[PDB]
Amino acid sequence: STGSATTTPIDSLDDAYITPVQIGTPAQTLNLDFDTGSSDLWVFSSETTASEVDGQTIYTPSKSTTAKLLSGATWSISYGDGSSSSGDVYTDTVSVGGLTVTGQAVESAKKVSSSFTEDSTIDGLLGLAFSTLNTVSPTQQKTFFDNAKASLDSPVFTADLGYHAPGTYNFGFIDTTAYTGSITYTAVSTKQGFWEWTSTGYAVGSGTFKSTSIDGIADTGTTLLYLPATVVSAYWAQVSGAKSSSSVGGYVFPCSATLPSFTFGVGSARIVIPGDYIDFGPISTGSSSCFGGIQSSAGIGINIFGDVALKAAFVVFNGATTPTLGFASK
């Protein structure tokens, strides 16, 4: 089997991407944030505290003839941005782009933190990291991809995120028309539960490539590119007037600037992030200070190849017995 679904930016800055997902019988369609940095499929629901729901579409398990309470199971997750959610668990039928999994754990939110409530466009998350990170207790549950894998034509999914435009998540096949050149594959460590890999270096603009190992994760659920402070300083030093602002919380730059590209290495191959992809717009409405799309990972503990990086590439998440990642230009 295969599946193919369009993913759409939630706003004009590509702050996140939403993909429609069918849950239950009859189908209830919710727009979920596909997140290769976590491993829980959770939704706003009829059980979510009413004051914490503000415009999201909810899953109502009582209206699904295939929903079953997973008795005793609870979940609770906290994300790298400080947001969180928790609740109980149902199993139900879940379909993405024509690919159907029966018996998928659908984690129903009883509580969500303020940033989830405030984002009316995201109805939940669909985790695509390794199932060892799934938070369900006392019986850990499998991700949608893990449940689907055996049925897929090939044990892979691909992320093709757009810049200021829709893109595609495919399951079970590699669309050879969706990229240019060849796909360069690189090793993955699953020891922390992430799609963790090692970039071979970077360049800023037309500058010479610096060969240096940068361990990090491919995370579709993180907006920006988080890299070591040395690398980030070298980038922003090329932008007149750019500075790290403790009050804003990262590097800012004059909105009048034209930004240089940033290149990252995948083995001997190179992925070029155009400068425009690094512009996240005014820090507050009407400001002439703009927020940078490349930020320091120093306070995280891990480098994160988020959407800024991934949207410049066609990315293969290869879930073969030994997982690997593939990157192609597009």
Sheet with 294-296, side-by-side order of all strands: 269-273, 262-266, 196-204, 210-218, 303-305, 225-227, 294-296
Q: Which CATH superfamily is domain 5-174 in?
A: Acid Proteases (2.40.70.10)
Token readout for 40 is 């829980």
> How far apart are the C-alpha atoms of 318 and 128, rounded to whole Å?
12
99-112 and 41-43 beta bridge pairing = parallel
Radius of gyration of the chain (CA): 20
Q: What resolution in angstroms does the PDB record give?
A: 1.1
| CB neighbours of residue 264 within 10 Å | 25
- Under CATH, which number does the domain 175-330 receive? 2.40.70.10
| Residue 123 annotated as catalytic | no
| Contact assessment for residue 58 and residue 152, using Cβ atoms and an 8 Å cutoff | no
Q: How far is CA 14 from the centre of its chain?
A: 12
| Contact assessment for residue 33 and residue 20, using Cβ atoms and an 8 Å cutoff | no
| Contact assessment for residue 85 and residue 77, using Cβ atoms and an 8 Å cutoff | yes
Token readout for 63 is 């209206």
Same fold for the pair 5-174 and 175-330: yes
> How far apart are the C-alpha atoms of 228 and 216, rounded to whole Å?
10
DSSP states of 180-236 as a string?
SS-PEEEE-B-TTSS-EEEEEEEEETTSPPEEEEEEEEE-TT--SEEE-HHHHHHHH
| Residue 239 CB-density burial (10 A; 0-12 exposed, 13-18 middle, 19+ buried) | buried
Residue with tokens 């579709």: 220
Instruction: Produce one character per residue of 76-99: b if its CB has 16 or more CB atoms within 10 Å, e if not.
Output: ebebeeebebbbbbbbbbbbbbeb
So where are the chain's domains? 5-174, 175-330
| Contact assessment for residue 295 and residue 144, using Cβ atoms and an 8 Å cutoff | no
| Residue 145 CB-density burial (10 A; 0-12 exposed, 13-18 middle, 19+ buried) | buried
- DSSP reduced 3-state for 117: helix
Catalytic pick among 64, 85, 199, 261: 199
* Maximal CA-CA distance, the chain: 60
- Alpha helices per DSSP H over 273-330: 307-310
Q: In terms of residues, how long is the chain?
A: 330
| Residue 199 annotated as catalytic | yes
